[PDB]
């Protein structure tokens, strides 16, 4: 349709006829709105006029007309009839108009899929998601999500390699898209963001998908959304342990302060006071800070799957343990002193790796894990090894039933675990001694420590029995 | 290029004042929310937000100007001027181009700052030679910020 050309006139004189045809069909369905297609069995007169009319339509060989009718069906929303044509003519017509409009591309893709041509649909959807057409972020998320699905299934005549490469590009773009969508939503809803800025954020984020650098620098880092920063380091395969840990430290501290604030507001309601202007009260005890913090760690863990570089257990577990000590998230407030260990075990950290780290914590005596607070470190080790023992015992029972002989990867216990418990007993003996000669009077934790000793000895016994042959005889009857 | 969603979260989290602006010379935009500032590369499809929240009072103006010659290391390409209701703050900027075609932005502290005074600052402009001029919505007066590398017993690094 080159402008300035003089066939336009010829096209316009046909468009006036085609429009009038629309009115006829429109008035037809209108006149016969509520009329049944069959009465007493055979067809009515209102039905026959519908067939006679639509006959004339499908009996035409005017091509500009049939194009105008495809466009018209699309307009009125009749996916009913258009997807049921059969003809390629309509496919070929769509193949030209696809890279141009979202609605048309969706029709094309629908045609492909019903013909088991999933890969071709995934290609159209992906390109559309990367394009500069006016498409919203959420629609780009839907397009990518569909492409991902369609590229993950076999399409005949296309190599596995070509499928996987597309499925992979869609998966990466979908991950980034979801991040961008989380940002945009949070920023717009953020009470501490000026309206003037929000409109600006909506303009640059509710469109084509942006790079991970931009999302980090211009948005996630500026607004201190550290959880999203971490997801971004994951999606970018960001190799930088120090920055990752700095972000973990900021996330923990930010969450702690927020939980503290919410518990304060609550305490004011239960005392009669008034909350700051524009502060929605809490009608129910909010969670203690260590509970909200660990909630944050879980949400991220499930989103990244522990196999990431944003979960270096050797650095992250000591930091969380550090937090617990330095912020009195312990028995004084009614929390389980082993909560940090429980958290990472349920999360699915392998028992061997846990004990391995805890050993390092105990040997190096760093940051807060010093003096008599190593009492706490010993308790964590006791709890970790205890769970490990229980695991080995159940895996033994497990393999006696469903019979066979195996055990790969999983670290297996060595004498080092036994030695570790020996040293742990020494540390306790040392802490108890130092506690008995403190200035001001003996320490109050005498029996508390005597108990821990018994537990540790019990565990060394068990571990010694397993190590000593009771582990190779677990699938045997006693 | 849509505004990142995280900026919308901060903007709608604004208590008193927000503002948007452009650094078109380097393909960056910025948003201020109260005493916090966020920059981002708008050419990037999923930008990361460069956050700067050292400021104590509401930001009223932000600008990117050339540096004064013979003051900073050659790798410093610009100076970021941040005006609040209490002071004006200078930050070193290095906007080095990347393989993708969008400048990589890193910020440097300077210890250069001056108390604002009684006159609002809503407009900041810079000359080719790095001179920084200020004006606002209190009066028609025009101020200039001076700065130098050396500290002196009779003169501060920034005036």
């Amino acid at each position: 349709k080159p402008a300035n050309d003089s066939r336009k006139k010829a096209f316009d004189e046909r468009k006036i006829c085609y429009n009038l045809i629309h009115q006829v069909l429109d008035k037809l369905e209108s006149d016969f709105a509520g009329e049944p297609e069959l009465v007493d069995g055979r067809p009515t007169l209102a039905a026959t006029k519908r067939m006679e009319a639509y006959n004339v339509v499908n009996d035409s060989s005017d091509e500009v007309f049939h194009f105008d009718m495809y466009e018209w069906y699309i307009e009125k929303g009749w996916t009913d009839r258009i997807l049921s044509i059969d003809s390629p003519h309509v496919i070929t017509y769509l193949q030209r108009l696809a890279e141009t409009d979202f609605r048309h591309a969706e029709l094309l893709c629908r045609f492909y899929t019903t013909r088991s041509r999933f890969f071709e649909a995934a290609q159209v959807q992906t390109n559309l998601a990367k394009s500069d057409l006016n498409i919203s972020l959420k629609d780009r998320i839907i397009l990518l999500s569909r492409a991902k699905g369609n590229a993950s299934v076999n399409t005949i005549g296309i190599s596995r390699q070509q499928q996987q490469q597309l499925n992979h590009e869609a998966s990466e773009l979908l991950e980034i898209a979801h991040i961008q969508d989380d940002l945009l939503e949070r920023l717009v809803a953020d009470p501490r963001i000026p309206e003037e800025r929000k409109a600006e954020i909506e303009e640059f984020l509710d469109g084509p998908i942006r790079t991970l650098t931009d999302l980090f620098n211009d948005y996630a880092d500026q607004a201190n959304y550290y959880d999203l920063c971490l997801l971004i380091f994951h999606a970018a395969d960001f190799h930088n342990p120090r920055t990752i840990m700095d972000t973990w430290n900021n996330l923990i501290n930010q969450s702690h302060f927020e939980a503290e604030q919410r518990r304060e507001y609550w305490e004011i309601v239960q005392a009669g006071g008034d909350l700051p202007a524009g502060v929605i009260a809490p009608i129910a005890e909010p969670p203690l800070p260590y509970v909200y913090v660990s909630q944050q760690i879980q949400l991220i863990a499930h989103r990244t799957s522990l196999d990431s570089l944003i979960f270096p257990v050797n650095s992250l577990l000591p930091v969380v343990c550090a937090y617990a000590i330095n912020n009195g998230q312990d028995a004084s407030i009614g929390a389980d002193p082993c909560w940090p260990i429980q958290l990472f075990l349920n999360l699915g950290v392998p028992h061997a790796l846990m004990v391995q780290v805890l050993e390092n914590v105990l040997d190096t005596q760093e940051a807060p894990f010093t003096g008599r607070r190593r009492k706490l470190v010993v308790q964590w080790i006791a709890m970790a090894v205890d769970m490990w023992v229980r695991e080995v015992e159940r895996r033994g029972a497990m393999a006696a039933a469903a019979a066979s002989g195996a055990s790969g990867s999983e670290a297996v216990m060595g004498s080092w675990v036994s030695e570790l418990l020996g040293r742990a007993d020494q540390v306790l003996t040392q802490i108890a001694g130092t506690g008995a000669t403190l200035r001001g009077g003996a320490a109050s934790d005498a029996e508390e420590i005597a108990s821990l000793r018994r537990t540790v000895k019990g565990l060394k016994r068990s571990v010694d029995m397993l190590l000593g042959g009771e582990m190779a005889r677990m699938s045997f009857f006693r | 290029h849509n505004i990142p969603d995280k900026v919308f979260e901060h903007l709608n989290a604004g208590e008193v004042f927000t503002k948007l602006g452009l650094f078109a010379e380097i393909g960056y935009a910025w948003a201020s929310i109260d005493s916090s500032l966020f920059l981002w590369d708008y050419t990037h499809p999923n930008p990361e937000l460069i956050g700067y929240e050292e400021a104590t009072h509401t930001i009223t103006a932000v600008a990117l100007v050339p540096p004064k010659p013979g003051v900073f290391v050659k790798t410093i390409t610009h100076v970021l001027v941040v005006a609040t209701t209490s002071e004006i703050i200078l930050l070193g900027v290095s906007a080095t181009p990347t393989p993708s075609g969008s400048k990589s932005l890193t910020l440097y502290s300077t210890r250069m700052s001056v108390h604002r005074g009684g006159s609002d600052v809503s407009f900041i402009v810079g000359t080719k030679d790095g001179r920084i001029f200020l004006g606002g919505e209190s009066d028609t007066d025009i101020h200039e910020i001076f700065y130098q590398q050396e500290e002196r017993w009779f003169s501060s690094r920034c005036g």
Partner: peptide, 14 residues
């Protein structure tokens, strides 16, 4: 993420 502010020592010469 709060932007890392590299020191004045690098910034200004000499």
């Amino acid at each position: 993420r709060k932007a890392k502010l590299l020191p004045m020592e690098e910034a200004l010469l000499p």
